Design a protein around this nucleic acid. Sequence first.
DNA 1: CCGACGTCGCATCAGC
DNA 2: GCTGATGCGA
DNA 3: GTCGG
Length: 326
Amino acid sequence: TLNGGITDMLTELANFEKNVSQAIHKYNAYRKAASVIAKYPHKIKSGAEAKKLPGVGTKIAEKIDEFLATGKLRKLEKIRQDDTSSSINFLTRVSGIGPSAARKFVDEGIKTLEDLRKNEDKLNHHQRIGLKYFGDFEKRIPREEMLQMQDIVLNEVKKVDSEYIATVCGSFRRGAESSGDMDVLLTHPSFTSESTKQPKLLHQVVEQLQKVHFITDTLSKGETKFMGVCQLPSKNDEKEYPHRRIDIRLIPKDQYYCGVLYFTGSDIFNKNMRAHALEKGFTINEYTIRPLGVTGVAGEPLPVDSEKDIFDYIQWKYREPKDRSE
DNA sequence: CCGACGTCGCATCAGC
DNA sequence: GCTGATGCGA
DNA sequence: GTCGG
Ligand SMILES: Nc1ccn([C@H]2C[C@H](O)[C@@H](COP(=O)(O)NP(=O)(O)OP(=O)(O)O)O2)c(=O)n1
Ligand SMILES: [Mn+2]
Ligand SMILES: [Mn+2]
Ligand code: NA
Ligand code: NA
């Protein structure tokens, strides 16, 4: 983290633009700049040095000059002082509360943690669970706990049906020493792009993880995606582990490589890779890579037998999971 | 200069 | 009820 | 907010 001060600054600008301004492309611009600067292997000494980097334009270069000369940015100094901004920015930290609801809550004079706790009846289910575990969801997960969680998820899934394959993705698969949550990719032979021979494939798994008190709460759930809450079991007289977010994605088994590419991330890596695909005239989702007809209309799914196959189509040298952390 | 900028799942609402 | 848009999230 | 064409 040679340039921690700069990337911190930009990320806070990105978060302001998303949460307060509701300007998503500015949020994306700041995040790209932050990402490209994070991996730049020199300590940056000027706005002009940084502007060489793609994603760093004129405006951000000027901010880096100010930041480097003073250690602060007056634009942020002011945002930090603004009641409305700070309130809105804070409320969005609760899972299920985004920019729209946070500004609406603020409009009704709900703007502190205490105000949320008194107005639980004004929250939807997701927001209510997010409020409940606000404290725990602030804490990161040590990789060592991630390994214990992996153990449990894989063994419980096996007990439901040995032909399930469960794969932990996200920052875990990228080798991170701590993660924000756990991401689990699920496949089963009965669910392919061509047919769903068995129903409740995700539900049965979720049910089992609840039965053993691993999954404690549900934020959302359908046939292919689960979002919820889980907790490691603790020992006698031990303090309980924090509750953790968990996401599960059931992917058609024949489309595992697109699915694991997607769920491994990072989010910025996926966005840049999909953008680059479009420049090369392909489109990538979690299921397929497809060519773009001169029209614009996507064509038929191309054969894919490895993650690398996907990289090969768009003329990118392969990158290991641990190197996709943009 | 200029829009053109990843892709999709589930919850909730509006309009019918 | 269904359809399609909006919010929030992966 | 950036920038390719
Ligand atoms: N905007 C987003 C968010 C998520 N992702 C897909 C890939 C991200 O790695 C991933 C899993 O989402 P995530 O859990 O929110 N982030 P990730 O696991 O990479 O890092 P953590 O903050 O969980 O440690 O899903 C995406 O493609 N676009
Ligand atoms: Mn994750
Ligand atoms: Mn996740
Ligand atoms: Na640049
Ligand atoms: Na939120």
